[PDB]
């Protein structure tokens, strides 16, 4: 045979990693360099802009760390986009830009700095950086959090970054990772970045799949056909959504329904029940052995 | 001609006969070894 490797001594000596490390959600080596404040700043908050891209959503939220747990100050999800007129295609780059913009303008609405630092009204995709206006309250700066995303060129985390930057946040960045930075020649095609923001990567592919095989087109873009969006509706829809977001970025909470108090799972049984279980198990095994023998 | 090498025998008796005096408690301690761009700030806050 072979020695059992997950031995009782193995479980005695075994040390766990952190809970979020075991779940996989948190990179602590990146987290400590992101989130810790210099000690001569003395309880001054250090705001970070967390982007998490999901299968059906994009979570964009701004947070600073206290001891008992980091406070979220503002949030903006991709499933708030049908309020602003994006019915469908919620996990793509354009929706990432829209929710970054919504996070930015909603935070500026919370702090009362809407009419100052309005940022790029006309989307271009250049180097944009919010200069702080003297005599006014200074521009909000925060630091981009990507978590565990491989930050290569064209990432929707950098799409949400461009959304917050054009919304008016002073996030430090550079145009190496935006879609359009040509790798071999080291320049940045802002028109390509702009059509990626406005979604012509999806609309051009939609016009592509309309050509050769339309049931594959319906298999790819199903609810685009159901929600009546077409490649000539595409760019104007995102521009109307940008105008709607920059017009009214405040967020309502849904009124809470009164609970029925229904226990949807199975609660933890006491020690009396699980001692009685094995008592009648031993009684059952003995009374089933004595007759079968 | 060997010798006794190291000892700490009569040393504690020699210390306490004048006493191990604790350092001089004094308010307004100095500002040497403080962060110099903090102390620039402090000196401009004093001069204005």
């Amino acid at each position: 045979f072979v020695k059992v490797v997950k031995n009782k001594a193995y479980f005695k000596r075994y040390q766990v990693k952190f809970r979020r490390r075991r779940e996989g959600k948190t990179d602590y080596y990146a987290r400590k360099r992101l989130v810790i404040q210099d000690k001569n700043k003395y309880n001054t908050p250090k705001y970070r802009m967390i982007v998490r891209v999901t299968n059906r959503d994009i979570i964009c939220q701004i947070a600073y760390a206290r001891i008992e747990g980091d406070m979220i100050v503002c949030a903006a999800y991709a499933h708030e986009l049908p309020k602003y007129g994006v019915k469908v295609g919620l996990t793509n780059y354009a929706a990432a830009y829209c929710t970054g913009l919504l996070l930015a303008r909603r935070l500026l609405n919370r702090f009362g700095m809407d009419k100052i630092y309005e940022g790029q009204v006309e989307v271009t995709g250049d180097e944009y950086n919010v200069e702080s206006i003297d005599g006014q309250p200074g521009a909000f700066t925060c630091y981009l959090d990507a978590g565990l995303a491989r930050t290569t060129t064209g990432n929707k985390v950098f799409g949400a970054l461009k959304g917050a930057v054009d919304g008016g946040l002073s996030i430090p960045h550079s145009t190496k990772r935006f879609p359009g930075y040509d790798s071999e020649s080291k320049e940045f095609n802002a028109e390509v970045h702009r059509k990626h923001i406005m979604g012509q990567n999806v609309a051009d592919y939609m016009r592509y799949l309309m050509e050769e095989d339309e049931d594959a087109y319906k298999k790819q873009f199903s609810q685009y056909i159901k929600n009546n969006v077409t490649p000539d509706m595409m760019e104007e829809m995102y521009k109307k959504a940008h105008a709607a977001i920059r017009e009214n970025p405040v967020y309502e909470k849904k009124p809470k329904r009164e609970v029925k108090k229904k226990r949807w799972n199975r609660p933890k049984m006491s020690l009396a029940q699980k001692k009685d279980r094995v008592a009648q198990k031993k009684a059952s095994f003995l009374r089933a052995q004595e007759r079968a023998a | 001609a060997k010798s006794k090498n190291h000892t700490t025998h009569n040393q504690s008796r020699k210390w306490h006969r004048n006493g191990i005096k604790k350092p001089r408690s004094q308010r307004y301690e100095s500002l040497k070894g403080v962060d110099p761009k903090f102390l620039r700030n402090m000196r401009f806050a004093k001069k204005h």
Binding site: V278, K281, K282, F285, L286, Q289 | -
Partner: protein
């Protein structure tokens, strides 16, 4: 060959075992520690007598083997060749040192490994013999005549434990009949009320 054992008697030094640092240690000449009919069950040698030290001293590994041979040679005469089980329960680990002279003097003094010795606390079982309950005085006399090989002071105590176990003699057959401990050779295995229930089923089946 070796110097008298009144020299290396008291537990003076720190326990200095045969290890990575002390190398070249000559082997302690006791190497058989238990013998007799050591291949036996627990049911057939209940009685057990312990030679218990009563001094904090060092017993040499040569005196251990001398006393083992003296306690074996009596019971092969007395109890027959398979009617007992000696277990010496002090393995020697403390290696002792020797500064031998040939003229340098005392300068540069740290001994070479000479022998191995066993440091024995107050009230500790040196040797223990299990046999039938009818061979009680044979254990007493065997341990008595094996006392004279050791230095110091030893008493002889016949325990209340069933053989080489940690369970009492008035409770051993009770707990066997209750199936709370099961034989596996020289000793027993204690079954708690804590395992998974299939191990309960497998012993009650």
């Amino acid at each position: 060959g070796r110097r008298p054992a009144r020299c290396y008697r008291y537990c003076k030094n720190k326990p200095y075992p045969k290890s990575r640092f002390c190398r070249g240690v000559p082997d302690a000449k006791i190497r058989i520690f238990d013998l007799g009919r050591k291949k036996a069950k627990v049911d057939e040698f209940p009685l057990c007598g312990h030679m218990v030290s009563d001094e904090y001293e060092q017993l040499s590994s040569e005196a251990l083997e001398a006393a083992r041979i003296c306690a074996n040679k009596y019971m092969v005469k007395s109890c027959g060749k398979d009617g007992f089980h000696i277990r010496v329960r002090l393995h020697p680990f403390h290696v002792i040192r020797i500064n031998k002279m040939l003229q340098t003097g005392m300068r540069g003094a740290f001994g070479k490994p000479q022998g191995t010795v066993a440091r024995v606390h107050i009230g500790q079982v040196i040797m223990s013999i299990r046999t039938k309950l009818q061979n009680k005085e044979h254990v007493v006399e065997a341990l008595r005549r094996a006392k004279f090989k050791f230095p110091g002071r030893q008493k002889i105590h016949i325990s209340k434990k069933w053989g080489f176990t940690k369970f009492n003699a008035d409770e051993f057959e009770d707990m066997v009949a209750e199936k709370r401990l099961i034989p596996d050779g020289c000793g027993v295995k204690y079954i708690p009320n804590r395992g998974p229930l299939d191990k309960w089923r497998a012993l009650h089946s």
